[PDB]
Homo-oligomer: A and B are copies of this chain.
Amino acid sequence: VNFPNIPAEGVQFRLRARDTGYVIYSRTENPPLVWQYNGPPYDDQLFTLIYGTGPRKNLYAIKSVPNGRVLFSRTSASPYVGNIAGDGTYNDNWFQFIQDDNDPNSFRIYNLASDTVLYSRTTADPKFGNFTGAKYDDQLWHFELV
């Protein structure tokens, strides 16, 4: 089931993991360019959504406010999670927000092209990344409105 409370197109938000409380950031310089962060609000944590239409209905591109790059999540090459210029040129730029089976207020950030979800953990490296497989709580996210 698609998450019922997806931010309106163009509305700004942070993506915060339910369990770690870490936020995603997306920047242009200094690897890792997309990663997680525990600390104060910065502009590279701000995103908006481009709403997919036609064949991309129910999918969304996640665009970074300061730099305008969209997120990707792939299994084909490293880095697996990153950003790229444009408004969603590549199929791996398109995400579905899938409501959790148990928790109605959180969702998985799912990539149809790569069959992956994003995760945030405090355990082992890599502490942020993507994953194809079973459902774990560390894959659960909130939209944090600003």
Contact = CB atoms under 8 A, between A and B. Distances in A.
A127 interface: no
A54 B54 CA distance: 13
B115 A58 contact: yes
A96 interface: yes
> Can you tell how many copies of this chain the complex includes?
2
A1 B55 contact: no
Contacts of A115: 1-2, 58
Nearest to A117: B1
Contact of A135 (B57, B94, B101): B101
Nearest to A132: B1
A134 to B, nearest CB: 7
Nearest to A92: B57
